[PDB]
C-alpha cells in the first residue's frame, strides 16, 4: 500500500534480506510476498557485484558496524549523486547490505547477535529518506516493485 514507504515496512524488508543471507529465517509462515520476490533479485545482484568487486572488497576490512555504516553511507552517496532513482538502484542497496554482513561475519572484531539488526536499520534509514518519495510515486513495494519483478 501507500504506507509501505514508511520506516517499519522498509526495516522489515532489510532485516528479512539479511536473515536470508545469514540463513536464519525466522519462524512463522514466512516473509511477505514483497520480501520473497526481493530476495531472489537482490541475491542475483549480490553475486554479480561480489564478482565484479572481488579485488576491491578484499582490500577493505569491515571490522565493525561503524566501518560498515560509514562505507555504506559513502557508497550510497556516490551511487545516487546524479539524482537518479529507479528499482534497479534500490535493489543494489539490499545487495550491498548482504555484502557487508558477509564481510562482518569474517572480520568483525566484536560480534554481537544484533549486528544484522543495526545494519538493517541504517539501510532502511537511507532507503526511506533518500528514495521513499520516488518509491511511493511509483506504486510502492506491492504495486510497483512486486508488479515489475514478480514472475509473469
Amino acid at each position: 500500500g501507500m504506507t509501505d514507504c514508511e520506516f517499519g515496512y522498509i526495516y522489515r524488508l532489510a532485516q528479512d534480506y539479511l536473515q536470508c543471507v545469514l540463513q536464519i529465517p525466522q519462524p512463522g509462515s514466512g516473509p511477505s510476498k514483497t520480501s520473497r520476490v526481493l530476495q531472489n533479485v537482490a541475491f542475483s545482484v549480490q553475486k554479480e557485484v561480489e564478482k565484479n568487486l572481488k579485488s576491491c572488497l578484499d582490500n577493505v576490512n569491515v571490522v565493525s558496524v561503524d566501518t560498515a555504516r560509514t562505507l555504506f553511507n559513502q557508497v550510497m552517496e556516490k551511487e545516487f549523486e546524479d539524482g537518479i532513482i529507479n528499482w534497479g538502484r534500490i535493489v543494489t542497496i539490499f545487495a550491498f547490505e548482504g555484502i557487508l554482513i558477509k564481510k562482518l561475519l569474517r572480520q568483525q572484531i566484536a560480534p554481537d547477535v544484533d549486528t544484522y539488526k543495526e545494519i538493517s536499520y541504517f539501510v532502511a534509514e537511507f532507503i526511506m529518506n533518500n528514495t521513499g518519495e520516488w518509491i511511493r510515486q511509483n506504486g510502492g513495494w506491492e504495486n510497483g516493485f512486486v508488479k515489475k519483478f514478480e514472475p509473469k
Binding site: N52, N59, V75, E79, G88, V91
Partner: peptide, 22 residues
Amino acid sequence: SYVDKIADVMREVAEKINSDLT
C-alpha cells in the same frame, strides 16, 4: 576514491537490472 570504484559497479549493475527486465 576507492568508494567511487564500488559505486560505479553498483550503478552499472543497477541499470543492467532495469534493462534486463525486457
